[PDB]
Design a protein around this ligand. Sequence first.
Ligand SMILES: NC(=O)c1ccc[n+]([C@@H]2O[C@H](COP(=O)([O-])OP(=O)(O)OC[C@H]3O[C@@H](n4cnc5c(N)ncnc54)[C@H](OP(=O)(O)O)[C@@H]3O)[C@@H](O)[C@H]2O)c1
Length: 271
Amino acid sequence: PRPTVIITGASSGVGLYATKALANRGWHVIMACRNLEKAEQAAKNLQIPPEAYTILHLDLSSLASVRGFVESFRALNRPLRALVCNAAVYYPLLKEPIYSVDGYEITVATNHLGHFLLINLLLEDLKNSPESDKRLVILGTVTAPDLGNLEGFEKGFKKPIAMINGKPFKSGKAYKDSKLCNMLTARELHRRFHESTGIVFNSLYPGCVADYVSQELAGERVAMVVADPEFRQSGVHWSWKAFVQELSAEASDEQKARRLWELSEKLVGLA
Ligand SMILES: NC(=O)c1ccc[n+]([C@@H]2O[C@H](COP(=O)([O-])OP(=O)(O)OC[C@H]3O[C@@H](n4cnc5c(N)ncnc54)[C@H](OP(=O)(O)O)[C@@H]3O)[C@@H](O)[C@H]2O)c1
């Protein structure tokens, strides 16, 4: 019946090669992508058997699209074994911010807020699934950049607010802030839900993937964290030969992780 894993941002890079690696291991991969034609071209391009994947539309920068993707996935009537939050956007050259359809600065909106809504919905599916070895894996970063007292979120994160700490827009820092949000979400997931659900919640940094380690190897590392018994440990950040990486003070701040969660629920319409 083939275990089922959802991978966001599966049409390129780490996510595409993770799709390849898990399809090779006998999994059925849901490629959750925003450009359906680029995704089908990429899967064919890597010679992934069509039995092993299903492409569904997901645009993380639109909260309505997130809910639409979840609807489409649930219509397949496939029990979920794992979720990989891999998609990310980075805009190195912007000097002024870009806002999502929902009104949110696009880097944080895509990399954190859209994933945050997706996680909260698909947690329901992981809980209900009868699989015994269920995992939610978040792609993190090397930096283990600062959210202040989350003033930008406390005020609702609408234009002209463009940074989580409410200070002036900086595009490179917006990216790092968004990856710190990913790390804090992985930590709060473990704290709140690991004992209650038995789901393994962790993160990983696969290495520096110019395009240094290859995209193919990075994808294989994602597959190990998803599938291999040696990585069945909740609440840890894996880094590379793999080791448990101690996190920064800000990423280990449990009050901040909880407050980020509460404010994020509000911003995505879950409160
Ligand atoms: N590259 C590195 O060295 C490195 C290092 C550490 C961590 N990471 C992390 O690894 C993960 C993947 O990175 P990558 O290097 O493989 O980058 P990538 O090749 O540019 O792939 C990013 C994927 O995310 C998707 N994406 C962007 N916006 C989206 C949206 N609104 N909705 C749905 N999907 C969206 C992209 O879709 P499109 O194909 O349509 O553009 C693309 O498939 C990220 O979380 C990144 O932070 C990367």
